[PDB]
């Protein structure tokens, strides 16, 4: 078991993302390093829901803690543009895990 339940998916229609600068950029549809192009896909993992149990994450000490499952993001490099100019590889934020957030009381 986990404190939070996550689910994974192959994302094939990402057209926009926030990059490491905190700016919105366009994510291109495909890539080319070798002989032919490769469509640009991402492997994402997100929370199934915010409260897998009534009071939040599973296994939390209800009396002393508030809790909530949250989707966390990581950086991956992606071929990107800015209003179809300045095409290049940028570090962008994508859903990568589900983490339990805590606060006393």
């Amino acid at each position: 078991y986990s404190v939070c339940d996550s689910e994974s998916l192959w994302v094939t229609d990402k057209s926009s993302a926030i990059d490491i600068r905190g700016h919105q950029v366009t994510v291109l549809g495909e890539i080319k390093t070798g002989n032919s192009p490769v469509k640009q896909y991402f492997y994402e993992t997100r929370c199934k829901e915010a409260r897998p149990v009534k009071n939040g994450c599973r296994g939390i000490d209800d009396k002393h803690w508030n809790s909530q499952c949250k989707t966390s993001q990581t950086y991956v490099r992606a071929l990107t543009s800015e209003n179809n100019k300045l095409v290049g590889w940028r570090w962008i934020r994508i859903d990568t895990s589900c983490v339990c957030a805590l606060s006393r009381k």
Epitope: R21, W89, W91
Partner: antibody, heavy 132, light 109 residues
Amino acid sequence: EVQLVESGGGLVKPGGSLRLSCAASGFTFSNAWMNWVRQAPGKGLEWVGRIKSKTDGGTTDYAAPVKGRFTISRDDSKNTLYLQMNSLKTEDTAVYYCTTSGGLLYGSPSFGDYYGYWMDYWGQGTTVTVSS
Amino acid sequence: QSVLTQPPSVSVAPGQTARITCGGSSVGRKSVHWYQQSPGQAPVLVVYDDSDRPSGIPERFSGSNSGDTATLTISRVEVGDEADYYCQVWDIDSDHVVFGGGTKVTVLG
């Protein structure tokens, strides 16, 4: 206007020592991070080291080829930056520039910070020649 | 200690556009600053944070960042722009400010 005036350059033999000064004016020197940057004759710019403001801890960091031989210090009551160069090497021959850092909104930059930390003022430099 | 790479030289005629690229190191993870060094003078900041211009720098000087590479573009070049241009980044992987090797911009006046 901001002024940075380096002094103390000169010619020494390998293994000698020199002490560079940089007299600053026209800005709150005590709030600025200060750097030394050098340029060997006919080559590019090379960061030598930095000293933080006292607010941000007043600590120093040095470039790899200079660590253990050079010491940066500052005297806020005289608005002066110092570079103590001991055990000099011929590779240390360069013009030495004094530099302020700008774009520090949050004190010491964090791991995730993308923007900030440029060199907004440079002095005109002092020449150090190390030759046998 | 990581290598910020620039072409060593660019020649341009007055009125034309000069372009200086910079890659490697922490480009894409930390912003790029650009310095102009005229012969016999100290460097001068001409672009900061990829694309911002300090006060007093002509609008002809603009920088851009394409993620893995950064470009300084000097439009309507003048003979006064003949200088060495250096890009600069904070290198995460070695805890150093690092500069590119420098690009000598020759203006054919």
